[PDB]
């Protein structure tokens, strides 16, 4: 029973090199063959290579010009090199056996994109006197611009978390995620109690509590 | 008669040209035969990588030959499926240059070992190329003989063909009879050689 | 490399029902040499079957694979709660392994209708330059909904992106928010925005438009 | 060029009966030597392919055996359908020769 | 039911030239290879020609070389046998017959009924 | 209206090479010349130098032995390499057009 452990570079830029390494612990290192598995949204899982100990690889035709595999057989790591990394390169990759079959990874995401960190704009959305049904209305704040992906919008610090969706960010074309939060409350309770979308950037360490009532 | 032949799809060659290909005499000339498809058989060359360049049939880089394929559909195509030419799937290092391995040994892929029976994580290692008609090309049979040309100490046993021409008498001409180099005139006599 | 398909895209199925799978590949397999993977949300892939016919070590039986050739079938004898994930096919029996398009599995329950939100945008994003108008749909069960956006009572398309979050753990139900984006003066100048639904839960399809200048 | 030579010219027997023919060749053909029945006035039917199959058809008792120069079929439940004549063909080679034959006679 | 139909044999003065088909039906001509075998009375079975599925490989037997040509048509679902230089031995029943693989790995699976040619003065 | 984007190494250590990357969006790339500017405190704006899509480049006569640009026009790339950082290199760097009359980067 094998642990594969693995790290590497969460981030990347493009035209440059993406480096990851896995560590086998537990049974035997050689005798073996070590693959990299890449698994991006959209398409489906992808197989990169193979090395063993002696330093013998198999490639992926598509894969083959820009992937190199080397192994440190003294402290039991294999790693992947993966030149020139493009913006179609933004997938999740997995160190297992030769075929997969007994023992993977734990899964590193892997992001290509040039973009420099930015904090959040947190935007203000009124409930709609259309919106409002008599007492089924929606709140939020949409969330424009941060180019990390990282990002959590709560509501009156954990107080409210019954109704709240929060949709998946969405990658804009000027490098930026977006994400937009909102809750269903009664009118009544929207009238008597104010709501916050607090929000919590890690990279950025911006703390921006806006409040919108109609 | 092999260069003016128009059947064969690559004739691409690397330690010699084709050209002056008879005019070179080698110690012996081995001629490897085997049936690939039609995407393997760019890896039939000097340093190059894949599982039939690996596993199954390896050319040194210091390789002094040519390579002949040329498509074989017709030849070898099933209705159902050949199942009969088998490659090498799984192995557990790479070849040496002119190395063939012939075992039917489990691979084991899995921690638990197996004594020679099949099962989770231990498989044949040997599998079966599937060629059918209807099959398009590149995965349809390829014909592959390779040349190696060998060059020892030992005599050179293979020339190539010594073309000559007719004989003149009586008239002073230059000739080569059997590698005697001159000039003179050549007429009939009635020395008795041994 | 052989070019592995899945025929059913998203297959929903109530609990306690079989189900059935289809891994359709370009080629004939060599030894019948494909396998089944499940990919719980958040975790690695974890075989099922190998062989396409026998059951890997741990797997209940509940998992049964058949097919030789070209076509495979997975069935699942009864839908336990810890099933529903996405299902990959892989084979051996070439050069580079190749995995399947994926396929996922969900619980099934009645069809529920879209409560149609919309909003107008804020102020202050005005001033910043960016008019982004959204329409949002809560609780709807069937996975297809469409947003038509009608601007000046005509047509446009290409100009806006849809965000669809992932099933709900209590009322097994979607949330879909379609964002518009807009320029200065065109948001300045267009008069009347709206988004159209076309759904399976209300035969009619229904319209609720905004006017810029009045709440 | 590989001709095929069956050392029976023709076998006696019966209804039920164990009979062994047997084909022999001049050089050495792995396994690619097939047999076929010929009922006379009619075509000839395969019954045995590759020196050790059976085709789908027949019933499974013709059991071929044999590989390299001599192929041998031995038949334990001999039916009133196997008195005909019996050939060998060798698939080694382009040019394809059968054998002379093996008339089966009721006795 | 699959079956083979083959016709355009008879009795033809020697030194001409005779042509036979030998129609398909029930499978797909464009798939298989067909063989051609021949019987003289009171005599065994000789091969005679082969052509594989795509009519552009052909081998004839050791007997009828050059004088002999085959051919097929995978539209007309017909075969094409032409006979050059006729001569007097060559009387015997035709057969012909269908094959997976053009060298007969697992061929000869169905035969047809033959048509009988009987060259004389 | 290019929209040019800017990323390389910030922290960087003395004797090193600085390296950055200009990206080019929007209209043609071709048949332009692309800047590169330095702006440092207690200093004021300084240029660099110039590229084009055939790798002809104008250099400043002061920082003439230690710059060194590429483009990759496969990409709509151009990258400006300075050679043996020191400490006095610390700043912010900009790409624009020839003049940087029309658009500039982000610094």
Request: net charge positive; glycine share 8%.
């Amino acid at each position: 029973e094998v642990q594969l452990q693995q790290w590497g570079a969460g981030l990347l830029k493009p035209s440059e090199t993406l480096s990851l390494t896995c560590a086998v612990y537990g049974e035997s290192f050689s005798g073996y063959y070590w693959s990299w598995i890449r698994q991006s949204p959209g398409k489906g899982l992808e197989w990169i290579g193979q090395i063993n100990h002696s330093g013998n690889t198999n490639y992926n035709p598509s894969l083959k010009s820009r992937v190199t595999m080397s192994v440190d057989t003294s402290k039991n790591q294999f790693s992947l090199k993966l030149s020139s990394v493009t913006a179609a390169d933004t997938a999740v990759y997995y160190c297992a056996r030769e075929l997969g079959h007994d023992y993977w990874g734990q899964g590193t995401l892997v992001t290509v994109s040039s973009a420099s960190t930015k904090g959040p704009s947190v935007f203000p959305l009124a409930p709609s006197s259309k919106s409002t049904s008599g007492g089924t209305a929606a709140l939020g704040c949409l969330v424009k611009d941060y180019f990390p992906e990282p990002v959590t919008v709560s509501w009156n610090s954990g107080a409210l978390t019954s109704g709240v969706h929060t949709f998946p960010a969405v990658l804009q074309s000027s490098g930026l995620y977006s994400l937009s939060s909102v809750v269903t409350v009664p009118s009544s309770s929207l009238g008597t109690q104010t709501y916050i979308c607090n929000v919590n950037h890690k990279p950025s360490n911006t703390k921006v509590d806006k409040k919108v009532e109609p | 008669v092999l260069y003016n032949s128009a059947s064969f799809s690559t004739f691409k060659c690397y330690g010699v040209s084709p050209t002056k290909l008879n005019d070179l005499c080698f110690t012996n000339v081995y001629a490897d035969s085997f049936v690939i498809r039609g995407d393997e058989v760019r890896q039939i060359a000097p340093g190059q990588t894949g599982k039939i360049a690996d596993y199954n049939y390896k050319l040194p880089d210091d390789f002094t030959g040519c390579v002949i394929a040329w498509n074989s559909n017709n030849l070898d195509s099933k209705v159902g499926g050949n199942y009969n030419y088998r490659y090498r799937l799984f192995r557990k290092s790479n070849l040496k240059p002119f190395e063939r391995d012939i075992s039917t040994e489990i691979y084991q892929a899995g921690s638990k070992p197996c004594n020679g029976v099949e099962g989770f994580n231990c498989y044949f290692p040997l599998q079966s190329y599937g060629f059918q008609p209807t099959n398009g090309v590149g995965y349809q049979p390829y014909r592959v003989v390779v040349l190696s040309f060998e060059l020892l100490h030992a005599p050179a046993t293979v020339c190539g063909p010594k073309k000559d021409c007719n004989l003149v008498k009586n008239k002073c001409v230059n000739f080569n009879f059997n590698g005697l180099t001159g000039t003179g005139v050549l007429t009939e006599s009635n020395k008795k050689f041994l | 490399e052989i070019v592995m398909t899945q025929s059913p895209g998203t297959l929903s199925l109530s609990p306690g029902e079989r189900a059935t799978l289809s891994c359709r590949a370009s080629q004939s397999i060599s030894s019948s040499y494909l396998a089944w993977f499940q990919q719980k949300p958040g975790q690695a892939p974890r075989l099922l079957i190998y062989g396409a016919s026998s059951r890997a070590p741990g797997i209940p039986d509940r998992f049964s694979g058949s097919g030789s050739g070209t076509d495979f079938t997975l069935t699942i004898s009864r839908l336990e709660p810890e099933d529903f994930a996405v299902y990959y096919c892989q084979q051996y029996g070439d050069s580079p392994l190749t995995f399947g398009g994926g396929t996922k599995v969900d619980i099934k329950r009645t069809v529920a209708a879209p409560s149609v939100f919309i909003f107008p945008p804020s102020d202050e994003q005005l001033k910043s330059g960016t008019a982004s108008v959204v329409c949002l749909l809560n609780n709807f069960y069937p996975r297809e909904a469409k947003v038509q956006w009608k601007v000046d009572n005509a047509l446009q398309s290409g100009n806006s992106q849809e965000s669809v979050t992932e099933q709900d753990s209590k009322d097994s139900t979607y949330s879909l928010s379609s964002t518009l984006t807009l320029s200065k003066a065109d948001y300045e100048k267009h008069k009347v925005y709206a988004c159209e639904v076309t759904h399976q839960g209300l035969s009619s399809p229904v319209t609720k438009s905004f006017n810029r200048g009045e709440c | 060029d590989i001709q095929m030579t069956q050392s029976p010219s023709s076998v006696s027997a019966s209804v039920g009966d164990r009979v062994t023919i047997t084909c022999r060749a001049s050089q050495g053909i792995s396994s690619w030597l097939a047999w076929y029945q010929q009922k006379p006035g009619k075509a000839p039917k395969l019954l045995i392919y590759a020196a050790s199959s059976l085709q789908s058809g027949v019933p499974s008792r013709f059991s071929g055996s044999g590989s390299g120069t001599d192929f041998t079929l031995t038949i334990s439940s001999l039916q009133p359908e196997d008195f005909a004549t019996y050939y060998c063909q060798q698939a080694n080679s382009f040019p394809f020769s059968f054998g002379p034959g093996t008339k089966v006679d009721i006795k | 039911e699959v079956q083979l139909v083959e016709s355009g044999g008879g009795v033809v003065q020697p030194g001409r030239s005779l042509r036979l088909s030998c129609a398909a039906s029930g499978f797909t001509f464009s798939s298989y290879a067909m063989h051609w075998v021949r019987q003289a009375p009171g005599k065994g079975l000789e091969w005679v020609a082969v052509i594989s599925f795509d009519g552009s490989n052909k081998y004839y037997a050791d007997s009828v070389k050059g004088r002999f040509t085959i051919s097929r048509d995978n539209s007309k679902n017909t075969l094409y046998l032409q006979m050059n230089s006729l001569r007097a031995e060559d009387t015997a029943v035709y057969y012909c017959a269908r094959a997976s693989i053009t060298t007969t790995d697992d061929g000869m699976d169905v035969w047809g009924q033959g048509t009988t040619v009987t060259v004389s003065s």
